[PDB]
Design a protein around this motif. Structure first.
Motif, short mmCIF file in Angstrom:
data_model
loop_
_atom_site.label_atom_id
_atom_site.label_comp_id
_atom_site.label_asym_id
_atom_site.label_seq_id
_atom_site.Cartn_x
_atom_site.Cartn_y
_atom_site.Cartn_z
N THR A 230 -4.68 7.79 2.72
CA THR A 230 -4.42 6.79 1.70
C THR A 230 -3.09 7.03 0.98
N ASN A 231 -2.48 8.21 1.15
CA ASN A 231 -1.18 8.46 0.54
C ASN A 231 -0.04 7.80 1.31
N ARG A 232 -0.21 7.57 2.61
CA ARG A 232 0.80 6.85 3.38
C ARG A 232 0.18 5.71 4.16
N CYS A 233 -0.78 5.02 3.54
CA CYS A 233 -1.49 3.97 4.25
C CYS A 233 -0.61 2.75 4.50
N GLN A 234 0.40 2.51 3.66
CA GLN A 234 1.33 1.41 3.93
C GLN A 234 2.05 1.61 5.26
N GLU A 235 2.63 2.79 5.46
CA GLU A 235 3.24 3.12 6.74
C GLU A 235 2.23 3.06 7.88
N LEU A 236 1.00 3.51 7.63
CA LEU A 236 0.00 3.53 8.70
C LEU A 236 -0.46 2.12 9.05
N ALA A 237 -0.65 1.26 8.04
CA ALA A 237 -1.21 -0.06 8.27
C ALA A 237 -0.26 -0.98 9.03
N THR A 238 1.04 -0.74 8.94
CA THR A 238 2.00 -1.58 9.65
C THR A 238 2.35 -1.04 11.03
N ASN A 239 1.86 0.15 11.39
CA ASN A 239 2.22 0.77 12.65
C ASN A 239 1.40 0.20 13.81
N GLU A 240 2.02 0.17 14.99
CA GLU A 240 1.39 -0.42 16.17
C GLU A 240 0.12 0.31 16.60
N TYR A 241 0.01 1.61 16.29
CA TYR A 241 -1.18 2.38 16.63
C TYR A 241 -2.01 2.77 15.42
#
Length: 404
Positions: A230-241
RNA sequence: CUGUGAAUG
């Protein structure tokens, strides 16, 4: 293939074991099939002794067969026989096999064939010895390479599936390191490892067999990993994987408390932007489908009234999303949720309130917009679905804007 | 006007 065998039908397993030429047969397409049939028969005590010595008793031959396209099957087969042979050499044999694997753990994990020997040993060895293999895993940058490897990622996933968490807790904290999480999560194979770890750390119906103490250990590891996600969920949510990982957390009922953390810390105030992303739009869909009602109301209000319309054309957030190549799937989701609520296919009670009247309001907004834009919407597959969705209800019942 | 994820005979 040795000439003394050319392959005669009267060839016996004992002939092959006595000859010294087993390595020749084991790496050969035809010879391996013979050994595969042979070791399935009724073996004498000595035949097994010879197999144990020649297949899993000599380290260099064990590695050569384990890393061989055909020999790896013979190794797994003999390992199974060794585990099923409770003679007075049983303890020594399993100890030596653990030592062979442990001393070459990383190279075997990365090998297309030897990683199958690892996985078979992890799930078949006595638990106490299988836990020892886990200790031989590396802890530096080689662990990253293992998690993102096309073969070795299944070794980690096998560890997570068959070994108690106490033994691999260091993997959770290794993955949860911010620098490591970014590398692993945005990889095709690494994201499978992370998702598999999250599922094993979930108190779902497949973990009800855990003792209270193991449940506490699981919960604490889950909280440590969820904090980094949840600390880098923005980066994670937009990633292809990595968008699959955010979707899984948001949609899994047994991760309910984290779905609200993800929505509030990542998706709130970014719905218009993320709804126009190829990968994050799927996350927004899941969030709408599964948000708690108090949060769903804030998400609806953001779409209907969280952005200032364009100063020239008056285009607002709903118009952008409703006609966007990815945003239209979010608007469809909103409409389906409201139609499910008012028609009784979805309950509306939460926190002491009945939100039925709130779904009525959101449906009325969406119906009014769809009615006014029905001609433009009728051009599109998405618009026709929205129109059809509203009609079925009557019968039975990336551009950015200034945010508020 | 449709939109994304694993390695052996």
């Amino acid at each position: 293939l040795p000439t003394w065998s050319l392959m005669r039908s009267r060839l016996s397993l004992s002939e092959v074991l006595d000859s010294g030429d087993l390595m020749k047969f084991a790496v050969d397409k035809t010879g391996c099939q013979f050994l595969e049939k042979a070791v399935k028969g009724s073996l004498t005590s000595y035949q097994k002794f010879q197999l144990f010595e020649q297949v899993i008793g000599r380290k260099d031959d064990f590695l050569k067969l384990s890393t061989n396209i055909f020999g790896n099957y013979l190794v797994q087969s003999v390992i199974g026989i060794s585990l099923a042979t409770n003679d007075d050499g049983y303890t020594k044999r399993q100890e030596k096999l653990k030592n062979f694997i442990s001393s070459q753990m990383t190279d075997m994990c990365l090998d297309k064939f030897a990683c199958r020997v690892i996985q078979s040993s992890l799930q078949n060895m006595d638990l106490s010895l299988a836990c020892k293999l886990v200790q031989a895993l590396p802890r530096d940058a080689r662990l990253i390479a293992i998690c993102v490897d096309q073969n070795a990622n299944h070794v980690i996933q096998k560890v997570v599936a068959v070994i108690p968490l106490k033994n691999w807790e260091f993997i959770v904290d290794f993955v949860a390191t911010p620098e490591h999480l970014r590398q692993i999560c945005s990889d095709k194979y690494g994201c499978r490892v992370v998702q598999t770890i999250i599922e094993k750390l979930t108190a779902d119906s497949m973990n009800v067999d855990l003792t209270s103490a193991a449940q506490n250990l699981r919960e604490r590891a889950l909280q440590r990993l969820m904090t980094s996600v949840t600390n880098r969920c923005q980066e994670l949510a937009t990633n292809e994987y990595a968008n699959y990982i955010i979707q899984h957390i948001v949609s899994n009922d047994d991760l309910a408390v984290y779905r609200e953390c993800i929505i509030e810390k990542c998706l709130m105030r970014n719905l218009l932007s993320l709804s126009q992303e190829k990968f994050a739009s799927h996350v927004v869909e899941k969030a709408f489908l599964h948000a708690p009602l108090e949060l769903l109301a804030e998400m609806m209000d953001e779409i209907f009234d969280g952005y200032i319309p364009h100063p020239d054309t008056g285009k607002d957030a709903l118009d952008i999303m409703m006609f966007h190549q990815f945003g239209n799937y979010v608007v469809q989701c909103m409409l389906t949720i409201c139609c499910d609520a008012v028609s009784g296919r979805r309950q509306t009670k939460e926190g002491g309130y009945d939100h039925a009247i709130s779904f009525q309001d959101w449906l009325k907004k969406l119906h009014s917009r769809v009615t006014k834009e029905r001609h433009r919407l009728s051009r599109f597959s998405s618009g026709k679905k929205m129109i059809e969705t509203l009609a079925n209800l009557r019968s039975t019942h990336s551009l950015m804007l200034e945010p508020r």
